[PDB]
Amino acid sequence: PQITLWQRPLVTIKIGGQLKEALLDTGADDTVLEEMSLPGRWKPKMIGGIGGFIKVRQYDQILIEICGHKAIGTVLVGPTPVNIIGRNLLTQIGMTLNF
C-alpha cells in the first residue's frame, strides 16, 4: 500500500515478544529502539544525529514483524527519544520512496 507523509509515518512492530510504536525513518541508517532486553551478544556503539550522540547496544540478526512482514535486521538499543525503523529494515520489506 501507500503511506502519506502528512503526519509522522508510525507503525506497530512486534519484537522480542513486545509491541512498540515506531517511526518509518528513511533518514535513519539503522533501527534504534528505547531500552529493552534482546537475546544474543551485542557490541557497544555511538550513533549521532541532531543534538549529538547517544551510546547504544548493537544486536544483529533480530527478527521483527512490520507491516505484515517478518524481516531480519540489526537493532540498536539505547536512550533514543523515539523508536525508529531505519533503512536496514525498511529495505527488507520492500519499502521505497515514490513521487
Next chain:
Amino acid sequence: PQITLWQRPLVTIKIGGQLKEALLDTGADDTVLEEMSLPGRWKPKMIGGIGGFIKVRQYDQILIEICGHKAIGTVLVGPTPVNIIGRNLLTQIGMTLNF
C-alpha cells in the same frame, strides 16, 4: 520516480541559487539545513533529535527545489550533521512511502 533504500536517499536540492546534497527524511517533521545565508528575518525554534535539542533559525516561504520539484516553505538553519528534507517539504513534492 522511485527511490529504493539500500543507500541513503541523498538528492540534489537547489536553495539560494546553489546546489546542495540533502537527505530525504521521513523521520523529520521539518527541513533542517547546514549553516547558510537566507533572506529576510528569522524566528527562533527549538527542535529535538536523537542526541538532544538544538537551536535553529526559522525562515518561512523560502524557495527550494528538491529532485527538480519546486517547493516554497519553512527551512530551519542550524547545527545539523547533514541537510535533511523533512515532511513539510516531502509533502509539497508529493513524496510517499510504498511497499
